[PDB]
Design a protein around this motif. Sequence first.
Motif, short mmCIF file in Angstrom:
data_model
loop_
_atom_site.label_atom_id
_atom_site.label_comp_id
_atom_site.label_asym_id
_atom_site.label_seq_id
_atom_site.Cartn_x
_atom_site.Cartn_y
_atom_site.Cartn_z
N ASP A 110 0.79 -1.23 0.00
CA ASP A 110 0.00 0.00 0.00
C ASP A 110 0.83 1.29 0.00
O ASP A 110 0.27 2.38 0.14
N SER A 111 2.15 1.17 -0.16
CA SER A 111 3.02 2.35 -0.28
C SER A 111 2.59 3.23 -1.45
O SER A 111 2.17 2.71 -2.49
N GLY A 112 2.68 4.54 -1.26
CA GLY A 112 2.46 5.48 -2.36
C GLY A 112 3.60 5.52 -3.36
O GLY A 112 3.39 5.49 -4.58
N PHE A 113 4.82 5.61 -2.84
CA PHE A 113 6.01 5.71 -3.66
C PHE A 113 6.69 4.34 -3.70
O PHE A 113 6.60 3.64 -4.71
N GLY A 114 7.33 3.93 -2.60
CA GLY A 114 7.70 2.53 -2.40
C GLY A 114 9.17 2.18 -2.50
O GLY A 114 9.51 1.01 -2.41
N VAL A 115 10.03 3.19 -2.68
CA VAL A 115 11.49 2.99 -2.64
C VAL A 115 12.14 4.04 -1.76
O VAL A 115 11.57 5.12 -1.54
N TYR A 116 13.32 3.71 -1.24
CA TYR A 116 14.15 4.64 -0.51
C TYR A 116 15.57 4.44 -1.02
O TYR A 116 15.90 3.39 -1.62
N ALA A 117 16.41 5.46 -0.82
CA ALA A 117 17.82 5.36 -1.16
C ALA A 117 18.61 4.88 0.06
O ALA A 117 18.62 5.55 1.09
N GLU B 116 15.48 11.05 12.04
CA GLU B 116 14.09 10.54 11.98
C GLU B 116 13.76 9.72 10.72
O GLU B 116 13.03 8.73 10.79
N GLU B 117 14.21 10.22 9.57
CA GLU B 117 14.08 9.55 8.27
C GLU B 117 15.27 10.02 7.44
O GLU B 117 16.04 9.20 6.93
N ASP B 118 15.44 11.33 7.34
CA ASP B 118 16.68 11.89 6.85
C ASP B 118 17.62 12.16 8.00
O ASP B 118 17.20 12.16 9.17
N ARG C 231 5.56 1.41 9.75
CA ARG C 231 5.75 0.18 8.98
C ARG C 231 6.54 0.36 7.68
O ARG C 231 7.15 -0.59 7.18
N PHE C 232 6.53 1.58 7.16
CA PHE C 232 7.26 1.93 5.93
C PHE C 232 8.74 2.13 6.24
O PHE C 232 9.61 1.67 5.50
N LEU C 233 9.02 2.80 7.34
CA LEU C 233 10.41 3.01 7.75
C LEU C 233 11.06 1.75 8.34
O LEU C 233 12.25 1.50 8.12
N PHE D 44 16.62 10.51 1.87
CA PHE D 44 16.28 9.10 1.99
C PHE D 44 15.08 8.73 1.12
O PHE D 44 15.11 7.70 0.41
N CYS D 45 14.02 9.54 1.16
CA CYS D 45 12.89 9.34 0.26
C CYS D 45 13.05 10.27 -0.94
O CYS D 45 13.26 11.47 -0.78
N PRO D 46 12.98 9.72 -2.17
CA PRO D 46 13.15 10.58 -3.35
C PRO D 46 12.07 11.64 -3.51
O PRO D 46 12.23 12.55 -4.33
N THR D 47 10.98 11.55 -2.75
CA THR D 47 9.99 12.63 -2.79
C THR D 47 10.54 13.97 -2.24
O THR D 47 9.95 15.02 -2.47
N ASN D 48 11.68 13.91 -1.55
CA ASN D 48 12.24 15.09 -0.89
C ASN D 48 13.46 15.70 -1.59
O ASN D 48 14.16 16.53 -0.99
N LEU D 49 13.67 15.33 -2.85
CA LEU D 49 14.87 15.75 -3.59
C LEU D 49 14.86 17.23 -4.02
O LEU D 49 13.91 17.97 -3.74
N1 LIG Z 1 7.82 10.23 4.80
C1 LIG Z 1 7.81 9.93 3.51
N2 LIG Z 1 8.96 9.88 2.84
N3 LIG Z 1 6.66 9.67 2.89
C2 LIG Z 1 6.55 9.32 1.46
C3 LIG Z 1 6.83 7.85 1.20
C4 LIG Z 1 6.21 6.98 2.30
C5 LIG Z 1 6.03 5.49 1.97
N4 LIG Z 1 7.34 4.82 1.72
C6 LIG Z 1 5.09 5.34 0.77
O1 LIG Z 1 5.53 5.08 -0.35
O2 LIG Z 1 3.88 5.49 0.91
#
Ligand SMILES: NC(=[NH2+])NCCC[C@H](N)C(=O)O
Length: 353
Positions: A67-74, A229-231, A198-200, A275-280
């Motif tokens: 159910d992830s929106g994006f679904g990858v991390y670096a 925290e995440e970054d 659960r995503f982290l 860490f999440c490419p949504t934050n680039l």
């Molecule tokens: N805190 C975040 N980086 N949120 C965006 C991605 C969160 C999660 N990995 C997803 O794809 O739904």
Amino acid sequence: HHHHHMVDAAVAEKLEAGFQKLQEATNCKSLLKKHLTREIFDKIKDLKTSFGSTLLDVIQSGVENLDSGFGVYAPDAEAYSVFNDLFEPMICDYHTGFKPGDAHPPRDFGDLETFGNLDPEGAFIVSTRVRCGRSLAGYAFNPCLTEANYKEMEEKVVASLSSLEGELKGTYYPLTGMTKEVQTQLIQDRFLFKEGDRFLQAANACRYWPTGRGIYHNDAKTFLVWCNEEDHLRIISMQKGGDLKAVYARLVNAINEIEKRIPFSHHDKYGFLTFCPTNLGTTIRASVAIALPKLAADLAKLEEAAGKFNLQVRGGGVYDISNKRRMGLTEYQAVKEMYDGLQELIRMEKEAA
Ligand SMILES: NC(=[NH2+])NCCC[C@H](N)C(=O)O
Ligand SMILES: [K+]
Ligand SMILES: [K+]
């Protein structure tokens, strides 16, 4: 140093199982499922970064959480290059106005004096927030940070933060040994983070918890930093009312002061690495809560009006206005899209009968 090629049997088995798990779930709508074609998967599944990170260290959160929106991390900074065949189409789908071949521009916060008053009377804007993220150069991201890395990084961060003066002076609260009293206080402030969801967890972002994790805020509670925290760093400036100049100026001063001591991870095409490419890119997440009850009668506000300035509108008659664009523009441009868009919206509100 790890080799660019060759993953072990266990990793290869888990990747194939993950690809299958994604394929089986036909209802899955993550960008991971969309973009990880069998062709891309077969091309990159045997590659590694020099930190030893594999494709499994990239995709596992999106496999375990369908159910992830994006679904990858670096898993480290190099992952963006090594696994670019996956990261690129995902990044360019998610972000607005960034396409393959583009290079995000060098950091430029711009001329703070060009930000005027937006709503000094307090008739419209409820609150103003600008958030950024940074990675510290020369460090892995979560899945391969060592315990010693967490400790060393935290010492560096705290040395910076604990030396901030004036408007930025404040207190650092380690998560290690954090008392119930401090938890309660920080929760009331909306300043507390806890072990990742659960995503982290699935991203291996919570190893050695809570070593190296902490929270800093200035005394005024208008400046917040989260460490690990995440970054590595999440840096937020905020206050009630609509003084975007003050909010942004405080953020710029803090980030510049931190950079003087600690260089940030940066990529030639993607800007600041997170860490999440949504934050680039600029990493900027600006959000202004604004009361527009007259405009609330017609979503000529949403698309069209705010959208002309690449702003997003989210909902009585109070809306969160945010920047759609994070990549492919400067920090100044992003914050000025907010400024200019909010100015147009306020004009429309006053002119509306
Ligand atoms: N805190 C975040 N980086 N949120 C965006 C991605 C969160 C999660 N990995 C997803 O794809 O739904
Ligand atoms: K896009
Ligand atoms: K652009």
